[PDB]
Structure 1
Amino acid sequence: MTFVALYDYESRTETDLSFKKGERLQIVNNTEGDWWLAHSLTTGQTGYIPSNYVAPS
């Protein structure tokens, strides 16, 4: 629902949200789902993925 920020965060890409400690934040619903940092055993590449695009083995 609604959350509050414990730390400052400075954006690192064009898709992340910068915010300051104190800010109130509201979680938005997306078809993508939560994003996870993942490593591909298939390609060896690594980076964030949309969780709703995958399922357990």
Structure 2
Amino acid sequence: GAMGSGVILRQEEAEYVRALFDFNGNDEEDLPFKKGDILRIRDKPEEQWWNAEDSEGKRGMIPVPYVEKYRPASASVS
């Protein structure tokens, strides 16, 4: 029969970057990124994934695809 139930195929993994610019959003399931400003938000530098209450009082996470890529200088061993 219809082996398909109606599922969307996504190829997204995770965006790793550091906060640089500052953009505002109006999404409840997301959070606006700030430019290395002073706010209460656990923004991931080596990763574009943040989660906390920004200066806008809003809390959420986003691939902050509006910042400068971040590469982990150091490396790990087996």
Structure with max Cα Rg:
2
Same fold (TM over 0.5): no
Give the TM-score taking structure 2 as reference length: 0.25
Give the TM-score taking structure 1 as reference length: 0.30
